[PDB]
Design a binder for this molecule. Sequence first.
Ligand SMILES: [Zn+2]
Lengths: 96, 105, 7, 7, 571, 573
Amino acid sequence: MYVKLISSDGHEFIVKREHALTSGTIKAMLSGPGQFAENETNEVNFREIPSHVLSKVCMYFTYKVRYTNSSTEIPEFPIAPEIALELLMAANFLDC
Amino acid sequence: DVFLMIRRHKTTIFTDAKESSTVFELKRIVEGILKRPPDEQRLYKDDQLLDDGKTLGECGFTSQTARPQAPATVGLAFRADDTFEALCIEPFSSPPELPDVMKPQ
Amino acid sequence: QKRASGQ
Amino acid sequence: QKRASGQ
Amino acid sequence: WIPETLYNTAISAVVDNYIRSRRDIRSLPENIQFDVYYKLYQQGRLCQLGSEFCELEVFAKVLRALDKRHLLHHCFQALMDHGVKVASVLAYSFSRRCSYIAESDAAVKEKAIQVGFVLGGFLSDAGWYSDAEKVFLSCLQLCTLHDEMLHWFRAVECCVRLLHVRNGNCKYHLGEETFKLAQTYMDKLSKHGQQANKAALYGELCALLFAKSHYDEAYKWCIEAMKEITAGLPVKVVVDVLRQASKACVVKREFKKAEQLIKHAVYLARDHFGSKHPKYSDTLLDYGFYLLNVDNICQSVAIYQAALDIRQSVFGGKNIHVATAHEDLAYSSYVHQYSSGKFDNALFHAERAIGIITHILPEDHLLLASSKRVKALILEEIAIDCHNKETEQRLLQEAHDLHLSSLQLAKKAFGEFNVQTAKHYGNLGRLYQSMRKFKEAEEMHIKAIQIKEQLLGQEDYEVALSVGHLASLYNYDMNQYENAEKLYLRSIAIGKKLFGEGYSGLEYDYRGLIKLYNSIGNYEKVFEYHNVLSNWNRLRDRQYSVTDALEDVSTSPQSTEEVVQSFLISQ
Amino acid sequence: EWIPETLYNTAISAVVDNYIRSRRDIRSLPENIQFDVYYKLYQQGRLCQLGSEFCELEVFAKVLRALDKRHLLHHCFQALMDHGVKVASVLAYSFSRRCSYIAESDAAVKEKAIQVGFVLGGFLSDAGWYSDAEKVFLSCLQLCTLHDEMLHWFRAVECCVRLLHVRNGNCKYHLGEETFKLAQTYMDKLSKHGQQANKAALYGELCALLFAKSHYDEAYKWCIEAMKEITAGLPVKVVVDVLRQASKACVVKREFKKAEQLIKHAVYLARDHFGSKHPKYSDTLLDYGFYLLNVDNICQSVAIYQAALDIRQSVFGGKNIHVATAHEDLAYSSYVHQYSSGKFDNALFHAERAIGIITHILPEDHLLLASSKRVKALILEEIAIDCHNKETEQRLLQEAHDLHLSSLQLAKKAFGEFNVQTAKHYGNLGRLYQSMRKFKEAEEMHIKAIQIKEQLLGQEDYEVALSVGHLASLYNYDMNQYENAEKLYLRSIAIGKKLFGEGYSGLEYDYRGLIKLYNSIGNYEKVFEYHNVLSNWNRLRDRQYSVTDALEDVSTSPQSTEEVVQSFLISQN
Ligand SMILES: [Zn+2]
């Protein structure tokens, strides 16, 4: 129930599988030949996504999954101005 | 409910623990992730051993400073064979430093 | 009216 | 006039 | 509450950092750049968006997102309401690019024409025909500088669109020249043994000749256009040809074929495009034209309001496509709510039509004549239905100057002997009838009748309507019942031949003859026309049980080849 | 004389004409230079080039530091909002977004953000964008409620003082009491550490809140508290605000002798420190006109509002809520002044301008319409009566009925069924139904107004007096009830002569109706003595037509601060 979102640098962002299927592209990568359970966690390679943005992506996964169907007013996801453009292209590619 | 980033060398475990849960459960949750016993690992909140007895709320992991938007990191070492190693937590990357338009140039 | 509608 | 100014 | 997507949060973060990443957005994928610019529109930053959309390099990449084009049409228009002249700036930029690359190979010219075609299609779909005509003129010059097969095809496809932007811009004198250029290029194409389909061009020429009120030639080119519809044409081409064919059939008094043509056009538009598309709104507008001209006015208001609500959604305020929807809905609400006297919604729409056309088009433009005419018709009926003689004079004088301006525009553009200037003559005659100036009213109605019977045969609907108006002038005002009776009989005969006994325009002739004979005698004639009017009222009440016209269109009634084949078999 | 232009202004024009190729380098200019380039951009009509640089928060922060040329910045900002770009909401959202990121940052960055938020929220509240200044002040409060330190309580109570001003003006009265309670909690937290913040501004804002909800009994107590809290070290703006709110609370409890001193001192202070062309001076002028209109000095009140509006049309621009409030205040004053003359040409023009602005900048379900609309719904009524036509009369009365129903619905939704504003709307509806010849409905509406207003205000209050005057006019002229009209006319006359003396203007509208009553019922001795009374009233009315302009009636240094305040405080015993 854990997946290892390896970034381009080599950082192995081990996030829960329920969180990773928030993004459509990761759900597609974990389907087909990519669902082969190598080790216990499925190593997803992201050779085009750096670590400083994949960390924000995983934080968004654990934020949306926790804050889904929230009764209280939901706080906005904090995206720094220097990361915003690179996290924009990572949000489109990952379809999250 | 507290959210953490258990980074050791380059891995970054994105886990969620109860505020009242102790550090021993935080070490035991890595058993299902990296499959190494909690005896041979110790955590690190910015050069601070996190012993099994004390709870997460005692060692500063309040839910205000470790919210899901920006979870609080915690180090880790796996004792190698018998002696623990230093925190080799590598920084993620340097995002492209956008120039300040108000900077005189 | 006295006449039809306009055209 | 009959009545005062409108309040 | 639900968490907003990382895509939208990142767009909000990129837009907020806009000054620091203004040029870095232009390196984004084309599906992210438009979302960022739409966020600029949503946030209210219309100035930054207008600065970006005024550059052809940025706007070309925005035009490549065809999914959210309905979102672009409401952004661009907002910019044109913001005061920034984005359409003319983009047309000028494209003309400058074409003038710069005139000395190059045939590889980059083909790239610029394809960018030119999408830009011109956007500028003519948004209603900026005077600004799309420059883009298409530049594209035509590029296709003219060389004479190969593909450039001949592109020149024909560009003169098809140049004819369209010179029809909606009321440049009917250049439309013949554009069609001649297209015909020359098509003849040169067929000389080499490669034939280009002529459905779209002949449909545009049908719209041209109908707008000039050349209904015989309009129907001839209607038949010629429907003779060139295949199964491989784009749905837009088939829809346009169906619309103009239905309009030509309506003005040729052939409602039996116009009904199937326009209902199939509406079905095709609602199927392929959707219920909130500008082309579907155009089909609804022509369908409302059909319904208004077949004595089915009550449904037409339900169609024009449907057509307008689509055009106010995709485009927004201060657009000629919304202005045409307003000036058509205002006339249909005027006709529907004529005997009721409730010209409150009708005038509100006619006020917006002039209020939009005056802003976006010059004072000497023909499209302002039709919007002035409708508001002058509404103001006249508000004048005679009120009690203040000061109002009865002020509104009548306003309608008088509006009618004179419309008549001057129509006379300058078309001529002295056209149908659309005879309609203004008839409206001026009605106005003079209301305004207690009868010597000029008789002259105006005589001119309108003479022009509309010299042109539109002897037993047309328009000449019958003007004959009825002159007969009401003779009957109720001049007391020359000998001529008024003859004109009433002519109008009744033509209305019965065209619309049958259930014609709603026969009441103003039956009551006219009743008053005519009450004035002179023959109470047997009074009784016979009274029971004829009673039978007419009974038949109208029987026929009044109508349904919604969109449901009358239904879903998948016919097929594309079936309707065209039936029309051609029925000549 | 043709003096050549300064090299500064000549190079400014050369920089603007070369704006596109030197846009980035302009942001790296001194604040005084950088503002002048943008003001030249506005002057040249290049709003889109100017508006694309005022949308950024940091670029707009430097032009906000030019405190000297703030009257030009307000005019540029109002031009931008009329242009179409929503810079007020864009700047507020940009501040909130860039503010939520540095919540955990150091004290220097948070201090800089708090200062930027104060200047931006003060600008947006001065410009009238209360819905947009609230978000800036909410974000400032969110910064302040992070570290429970010493200065953070002071900055948070300042934030909550500024939130009342942007919530009273935005008609968010339900959140106003909550904001005041939060501010009072933070003042208690300060008092637990042996430090007392100055509570004059907060109590003045609460007085504005309670006057807005028509809680004059509580508003007077809280303005007394605010005036007790005024010290010598207060800023001029704060003491001016407290003084004018205390005047508005004193004039509505009909303490005219104290209200005149408070508002004349407020006008004097506003004209000294701020000048004759300042937004705060215009606010004091509006409150002075409110005083003058409430004390039967209507002819001077019209000129005071005309002076108040002309400042707001110069400092601000077109579609602004401050210009709209000046219009709707001047429209009502011109209405009441020209009620007898019947020349409702300027009053209708000003009431139409107010609705034409509020509808454009505020939602249709907003409370600030309920004022403007009803003002028009008064004038449209009096034009309907003056018009000899029946069709135009019917149309105008129907339009006024729709406007009065809308205003009454807004007041009922905002305050409730038992508010004084709802009573005013019921009285206006009663007058209208009297004009609409619906006499039963007019009687029911006037009875409802009396029942609502009698318990809320005093038994012999001025508003009750004018409303029983309206009901007596209905009973006398229309319903031919000749005893209830008599007793209500006597009540109105007694209250008018008790409050304003023999110079009250409603006395003639009561005496003429009562003379008509007695001519309908007899007792010609009463008719003769009331003709004598009316002649005496006319004599005193023409004697009191001095109408000296109230702008110079405040004089130059008649008294000083903590002397008018001290006199008002000692007079309370
Ligand atoms: Zn602009």
